[PDB]
């Protein structure tokens, strides 16, 4: 859909084509994360540390339970009906999450039947069988630390030293816990909390958490880096200091009519200086519509772009016309840096600004020259089978576009400045010119 | 080159002058990082943990080896020639890196002659002598943990507890490893990967890695914070689970004709409110050209600005004229915050907005007043040798500019709004005014 030949002439060389994929239709599993360690077998060497810990931790978890209660207390079976009046104010995400929270409670109530097994857990990871068909896992914070560094050290270190080490381990745990489950978690209802954040409750060990839950392996690692695997806090127990988290495992699906095209920026010659075109590097095409995307929030791999939501955004008509061949509307920024891409390879064809990068032909021994009327030179099979740029020798293929690519030329658009300060300056200076024009026409209208 | 006297009058007080430095001409050393620990002396207490680990780790490293093979399989001795057709699509950075990768292979092949010594390594750090003249270091992940917390705990903790602790240590390692060597590493070829990221393969202990390699101490710490020290993955061994990394150690060189000037923003009076000029805080001057810089990616020290590449960017003509004395073109934003710098010290001269900050003279007992026709007052030796702002008493020097600094005055430029939403709003409202002007002139042309 993009006019790749005219675009490469202005420094935008066709790059890799990737599929557009978005997470959908998740499977769910519940996991129990206990934030308080089991110190039963070092009970004489805890002092008042656990008492201070429980108090401090309650001050972290209570605001979460409260936030969840607002939705739980106002959601009933009809088919789930919410008391919109009692909730008062909510976003769409919170509202749908409020229902998910309510429905999730029904299984949390089954998990809670094992409350005594959850409290009794003394291993970092315990698999509890509810009814054989139903299995829930319990993860315990700092339990491995205690089982290996405090319990077996009973006659290695003093009892008071053991107590101090416990206190510090607990304090360090909270220091990191607070970045996720602290005051920043103004909304524990919305199911958008990435699993790598939730896992801080278990030392940040999300790999253990996920393996524990089994998951599906079709594209597991892409799901994690794209933040598609998330969880929701369903239940908070402030007497036992554990939470129940529902972990969502979405499947990335392909959009049959959508792809993202990467362009490779190449500095090009104009007048007597280097220029770089300011056009989106990643262009999203869906059916017949060319649009933008906030790809900065997506995972980019060799075959696809993996997003945890739809990040498509609007594109202006002037940029769309730029992309379809009206290059007189493609904006360009001056290159002043000594470090800019000056060439790119695409499908065996080499595009280079042979004015700023030294170009020589390996097969003929002759230099490759560029006139002031040319932007980039296209080097292939027909001119130089093997070309040299700087100290790199490249064996080339053939260009499948116009054989007159280097002769036809191209229209060049207006200069721009992308710097934040420059943006404010440019808007202001244009307003001064605009007001002058307004005064001039008003004078003409009064005269006429 | 900058008109510092007119600039200080509009809230831009000359600050610290720093040298412009960029990393270049690196030396290289190869280091081996083994991601799999040696558990030979606890082999009865590993269960199936190492088998699961090897499988999971292979799923992380295989995509890296594959990405490297694309360049390695297509690069040959001529003097290095690349199969541009087979590579198909690449950026300039990848292409030059592809050559570096190929050349690096020649030493990786020597390192690999010690494959059995690499596998046998059971210490966190081992120095291996290849030929006395050639030395390679091997770093092993979690080896110190195992040697101190699992091996010596054989009759301290149970064998199964030891196994569980190993499994968790391995899982935590991968949890962090995945942020660097996971799906996000779409390009392991380009030699732009910061050493602090690579070191995650060794627990994030980059200080050990670097000391191990010796390095040069001229400005080592500046090189690290500026991300000038980087590495490239040269070889991946999926049977032994180790990688060979080439670490680049560049030398920061001074640009003989380039410096960066910092300006210190000071709120100033205009009409009956506070204003702050929106001019770049860090201005890059090279020879006779005034330009911008993305200094947000550079390290700033007392004497120099250290960059890992050239970050110079264009500046508009209106901003350049602002900086050289045409202050009628310097944009200003309204100050509404109660917390803005209201004064600055430069070369012993105090510049203050004595309308918004209370100014008193320590040597005379009299207040320092400012008229509505003045922006900032310049306070020095001639008016008040020691001046007081708020609760701070400052002994001052002498201003070397015009003695009539406080009498001459200055031109003030147009108002701006820098907020992202305000930028979109300002562009739109200007288009409505622009279309009205277009209609008015078209009507005049039809009438005439």
């Amino acid at each position, epitope marked *: 859909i993009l006019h790749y030949e005219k675009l490469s002439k202005i420094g935008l060389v066709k790059g890799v084509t990737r599929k557009y994929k978005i997470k959908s239709n998740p499977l769910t599993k519940d996991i129990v994360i206990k934030m308080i360690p089991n110190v039963s077998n070092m009970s004489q060497c805890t002092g008042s540390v656990m008492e201070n810990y429980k108090t401090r931790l309650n001050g972290i978890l209570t605001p979460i339970k409260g936030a969840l209660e607002i939705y739980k207390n106002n959601t009933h079976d009809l088919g789930v009906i919410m008391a919109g009046v009692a909730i008062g104010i909510a976003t769409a995400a919170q509202i749908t999450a409020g229902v998910a929270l309510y429905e999730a409670m029904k299984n949390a109530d089954n998990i809670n039947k094992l409350k005594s097994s959850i409290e009794s*857990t003394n291993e970092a990871v315990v698999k509890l069988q509810e009814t054989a068909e139903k299995t829930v896992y319990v993860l315990t914070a700092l339990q491995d630390y205690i089982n290996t560094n405090l319990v077996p050290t009973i006659d290695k270190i003093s009892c008071k030293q053991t107590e101090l080490s416990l206190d510090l381990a607990l304090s360090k745990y909270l220091s990191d816990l607070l970045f996720v489950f602290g005051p920043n978690l103004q909304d524990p209802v919305s199911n958008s909390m990435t699993i790598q954040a939730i896992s801080q409750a278990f030392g940040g060990n999300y790999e253990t958490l996920l393996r524990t839950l089994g998951y599906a392996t079709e594209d597991f690692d892409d799901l994690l880096e794209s933040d598609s695997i998330t969880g929701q806090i369903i239940y908070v127990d402030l007497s036992s200091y554990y939470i129940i988290v529902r972990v969502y495992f979405p499947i990335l699906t392909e959009i049959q009519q959508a792809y993202i095209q990467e362009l490779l920026p190449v500095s090009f010659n104009n007048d007597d200086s280097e220029w770089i075109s300011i056009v989106p590097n990643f262009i999203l095409v869906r059916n017949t519509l060319i649009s933008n995307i906030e790809i900065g929030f997506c995972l980019i791999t060799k075959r696809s772009v993996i997003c945890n939501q739809d990040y498509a955004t609007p594109m202006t008509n002037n940029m769309r016309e730029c992309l379809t061949g009206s290059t007189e509307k493609c904006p360009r920024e001056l290159v002043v840096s000594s470090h800019v891409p000056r060439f790119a390879l695409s499908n065996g064809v080499l595009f280079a600004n042979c004015i700023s990068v030294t170009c020589q032909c390996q097969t003929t021994g002759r230099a490759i020259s560029q006139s002031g009327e040319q932007t980039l030179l296209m080097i292939d099979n027909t001119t130089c089978p093997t070309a040299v740029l700087g100290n790199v020798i490249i064996s080339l293929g053939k260009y499948l576009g116009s054989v007159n690519y280097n002769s036809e030329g191209i229209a060049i658009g207006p200069p721009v400045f992308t710097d934040k300060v420059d943006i404010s300056s440019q808007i202001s200076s244009m307003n001064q010119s605009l007001q002058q024009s307004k005064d001039y026409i008003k004078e003409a209208q009064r005269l006429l | 080159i900058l008109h510092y006297e007119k600039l200080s009058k509009i809230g831009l007080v000359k600050g610290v002058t720093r040298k412009y430095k960029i990393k270049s001409n690196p030396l290289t050393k190869d280091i081996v990082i083994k991601m799999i620990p040696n558990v030979s002396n606890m082999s009865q207490c590993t269960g199936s943990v190492m088998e699961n680990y090897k499988t999971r780790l292979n799923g992380i490293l295989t995509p890296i080896k594959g990405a490297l093979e694309i360049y390695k399989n297509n690069t040959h001795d001529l003097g290095v020639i690349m199969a541009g057709v087979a590579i198909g699509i690449a950026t300039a950075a990848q292409i030059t890196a592809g050559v570096a990768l190929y050349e690096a292979m020649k030493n990786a092949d020597n390192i690999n002659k010690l494959k059995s010594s690499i596998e046998s390594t059971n210490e966190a750090v081992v120095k291996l002598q290849e030929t006395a003249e050639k030395t390679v270091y091997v770093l092993t992940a979690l080896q110190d943990y195992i040697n101190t917390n699992l091996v010596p705990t054989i*009759d301290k903790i149970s*064998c199964k507890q030891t196994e569980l602790s190993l499994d968790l240590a391995l899982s935590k390692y991968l949890s962090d490893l995945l942020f660097v060597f996971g799906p996000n590493l779409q390009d392991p070829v380009s030699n732009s990967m910061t050493i602090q990221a690579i070191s995650q393969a060794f627990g994030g202990n980059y200080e050990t890695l670097l000391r191990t390699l010796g390095y040069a101490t001229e400005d080592f710490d500046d090189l690290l914070e500026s991300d000038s020290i980087t590495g490239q993955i040269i070889y991946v061994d999926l049977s032994s689970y180790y990688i060979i990394v080439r670490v680049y150690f560049p030398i920061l060189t001074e640009i003989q004709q380039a410096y960066i000037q910092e300006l210190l923003p000071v709120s100033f009076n205009n009409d009956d409110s506070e204003w702050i000029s929106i001019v770049p805080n860090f201005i890059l001057v090279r020879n006779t050209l005034i330009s911008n810089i993305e200094i947000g990616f550079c390290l700033i020290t007392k004497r120099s600005v250290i960059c890992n590449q050239d970050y110079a960017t264009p500046m508009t003509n209106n901003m350049r004229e602002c900086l050289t004395g045409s202050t009628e073109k310097c944009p200003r934003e309204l100050v509404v915050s109660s917390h803005v710098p209201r004064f600055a010290l430069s070369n012993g001269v105090l510049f203050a907005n004595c309308i918004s900050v209370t100014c008193q003279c320590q040597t005379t007992g009299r207040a320092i007043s400012q008229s509505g026709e003045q922006t900032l007052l310049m306070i020095d030796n001639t008016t008040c040798p020691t001046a007081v702002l708020g609760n701070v008493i400052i002994s001052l020097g002498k201003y070397l500019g015009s003695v009539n600094y406080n009498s001459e005055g200055i031109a003030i430029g147009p108002p701006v709004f820098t907020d992202k939403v305000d930028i979109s709003s300002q562009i739109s409202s200007m288009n409505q005014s622009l279309q009205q002007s277009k209609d008015y002139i078209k009507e005049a042309q039809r009438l005439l």
Partner: antibody
Amino acid sequence: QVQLKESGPGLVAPSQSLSITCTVSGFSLASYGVHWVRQPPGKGLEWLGVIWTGGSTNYNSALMSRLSINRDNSKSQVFLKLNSLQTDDTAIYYCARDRGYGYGGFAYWGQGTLVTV
Amino acid sequence: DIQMTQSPASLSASVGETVTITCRASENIYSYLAWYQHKQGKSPQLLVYNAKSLAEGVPSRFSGSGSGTQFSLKINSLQPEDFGSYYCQHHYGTPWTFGGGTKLE
């Protein structure tokens, strides 16, 4: 106090499965592991397999293809199963609790249930 | 798996005499060895764990020692109630295993 009590079938034919349930009290199955041991008429004690505190299991090599262990953390029970019996599987089967964090020393044993094949 | 050899197969000793039982492992099991006293009609009683420590409730006439591959159990004053089959168990690697046992009259 701590107790373990085995309950299961007496005479079971060859080629039939065996299912013995150990009901426990005085401790949580989330805190301690449970091991199964048998005593054949003229042999020594034979360790069969274990279900660990963590809910995972291990078996000896001889019975690895026939022996399975499971749990119920709601009813405080541990389940010993053999998929197919031989006449030499005649033995008294015992349920025993391990010591804390997977340490050996079967301080606590059940009563023992005699299985005839 | 890890095999264990326990001997003598059968012992005869009078009341008040010192009685010892020897057990060796086919591999290195560090201090991971337990001893049991098993009477017929009853479940086995734990006597010693980690090759030396008595189980709570076990009479102090019992003691033991050992390391790696060579271990032993000692009774410093045999009582009438000490008749029974004694078992040597390792609990290092997996599976845990028992020896043939010693029958003490």
